[PDB]
Design a protein around this ligand. Structure first.
Ligand SMILES: O=P(O)(O)O[C@H]1[C@H](O)[C@@H](OP(=O)(O)O)[C@H](OP(=O)(O)O)[C@@H](OP(=O)(O)O)[C@H]1O
Ligand SMILES: O=P(O)(O)O[C@H]1[C@H](O)[C@@H](OP(=O)(O)O)[C@H](OP(=O)(O)O)[C@@H](OP(=O)(O)O)[C@H]1O
Ligand SMILES: [Cl-]
Lengths: 314, 314
């Protein structure tokens, strides 16, 4: 019997036309030297956050963490990114990658990091990566020499204050990454939800081509959901002997999200998120299974293919 | 010697490109039965507002006020305008005109009164009436079936909260006026400043075509600056034997601005308004003089022509 949307693909049921972009959102006010939630795999573990009801006494294995060479953060200003790159260059002599996980169209107007925000940050929901990047390219270019309104989100994810300017310079994140001495790689993943099979296939192929000394700096809007997902996936790929529990604990304890089971709770206005949290918990487990069952033969079978013959259970 | 901009035309010095529109502003939240600052010329006089430092004991002549047949208000929802029309129909059997004094592009999206707001509300500054109305038509059409953000302005005259919707219906104010049983006449007057010689020439020519029993409902955004200026001008035209002081007092005391001399005191942020207030005071006197000198012969020469040979003094 037909299943319309399998586990891992719940977001496909949502209607993109209901979340179209309406404002240039300020992604970072540029006040700090670094982006928020900045963390590397070299960092010491800290106490787990109370909301996840984890075992504070637990001491996760650090097997492979010194060699892992990844980091994560929120969005950043160009200056903040140069600070990130200088900081990482101290840890490695390999190429440093800015891995941009944002599906939403974003860039820099007069050096100000902005994104084209629709409700739930789903302005590019349902678009292929090709379409998402075309929207981004067109929108950014159309802003040049035009008057724009750039605002942070306040009460209820609506604009609050902000500023108005006639734009004199437009840049993509790629341009800003390269100016900072980083290589650039884009995975257009949708905010709030599990990355698509497409997203993950693209990441995996990318991962297989990296030189051994590559450092991956993942980032999304806040450096939480999407950033932690790919940091976790990378940790599993590179350190397949480490237990799922150790992976989840250690990626949370250096400053990420915890992607295991926990007592979920939402303000009723945030109750749409609940099923996306469960979905992510299940898919993390399914990806761990993929890594275990496909690493012997060197990942001959792509995630998307394997997932269709080995579907996840709600 | 060459004067670049004569008195009455100061706003011509400003650069339109510095005030381009950036948001659909909510013009009325629709919560009251009537628009704000609603008043008719049949209304009782109230005590003057203290900020104008007037003589609270002075009683201006009411000569001609019963026959004047004018009103003013802020912008309105379609339902509010029907309440206005109903209220006015009780007072007259003549044609009731909606005299729209707004240069800013405005209309109704799903019945919601909005305007395309640039800084200082100068998004159509410098445009001819033809160009302003074209901008308006094009912007309104372009909104149909599109996602828009509609916000009230809060602190700093920047968007605060508001709403996002996909628009199923678009209307011009003319359509809304006619649906309420009102005739429609548009004068594209710039917010905050004295109406241009073009604006006034157009109004005077319109005035001369009116039947005796015509009722004029003037409105602008708040129903203060522009609305009162045209109410005052109409009062002078129709009641030319009444003293200038009496005109100014009585239009203020039924609920309009006071267009005579008063001690101006601005917030530091509002100091740009000071010379425009002073300009309006001088031009109101100059218009009174035009009426006194040209009424006997039936206005053979228009305001714009007379003003050029009788320039106002700063
Ligand atoms: O950008 P990444 O790093 O993926 O992180 C996201 C963003 O911070 C989201 O905020 P925004 O939507 O403003 O970008 C936030 O949603 P809320 O701010 O609605 O909580 C997500 O939390 P949850 O979706 O709640 O898990 C969080 O995982
Ligand atoms: O629309 P009309 O009826 O002409 O009245 C205007 C508007 O209310 C202006 O508000 P906005 O700019 O929000 O449309 C206001 O400026 P402020 O609200 O900035 O004071 C003007 O006051 P002054 O320009 O201050 O006289 C007032 O005369
Ligand atoms: Cl794709």
């Amino acid at each position: 019997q037909t299943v319309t949307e399998p586990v891992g693909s719940y977001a496909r049921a949502e209607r993109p036309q209901d979340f179209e972009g309406f404002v240039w959102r300020l992604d970072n006010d540029g006040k700090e030297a670094l982006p928020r939630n900045f963390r590397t795999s070299a960092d010491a573990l800290r106490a787990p956050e109370k909301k996840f009801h984890l075992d504070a006494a637990y001491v996760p294995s650090r097997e492979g963490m010194d060699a892992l060479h990844i980091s994560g953060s929120s969005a950043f200003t160009p200056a903040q990114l140069k600070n990130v790159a200088a900081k990482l260059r101290e840890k490695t002599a390999g190429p440093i990658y800015d891995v941009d996980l944002r599906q939403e169209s974003h860039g820099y107007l007069d050096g100000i990091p902005v994104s084209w925000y629709g409700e739930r940050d789903w302005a590019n929901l349902g678009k292929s990566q090709h379409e998402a990047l075309a929207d981004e390219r067109h929108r950014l270019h159309a802003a040049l020499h035009k008057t724009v309104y750039i605002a942070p989100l306040g009460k209820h994810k609506l604009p609050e204050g902000g500023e108005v300017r006639r734009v004199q310079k437009v840049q993509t994140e790629q341009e800003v990454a390269e100016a900072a001495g980083m290589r650039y790689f884009r995975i257009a993943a949708t905010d709030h939800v599990w990355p698509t099979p497409e997203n993950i296939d693209r990441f995996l192929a990318f991962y297989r081509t990296l030189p051994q000394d590559a450092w991956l700096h993942f980032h999304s809007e806040a450096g939480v959901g999407r950033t932690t997902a790919f940091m976790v996936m990378t940790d599993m790929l590179k350190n397949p002997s480490v237990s799922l529990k150790d992976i989840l604990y250690r990626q949370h304890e250096i400053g990420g999200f915890y992607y295991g089971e926990f007592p979920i709770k939402t303000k009723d206005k945030d109750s749409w998120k609940t099923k996306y949290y469960r979905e992510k918990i299940v898919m993390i487990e399914q990806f761990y299974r993929y890594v275990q069952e496909n690493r012997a033969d060197g990942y001959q079978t792509p995630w998307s293919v394997w997932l269709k013959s080995h579907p996840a259970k709600a």
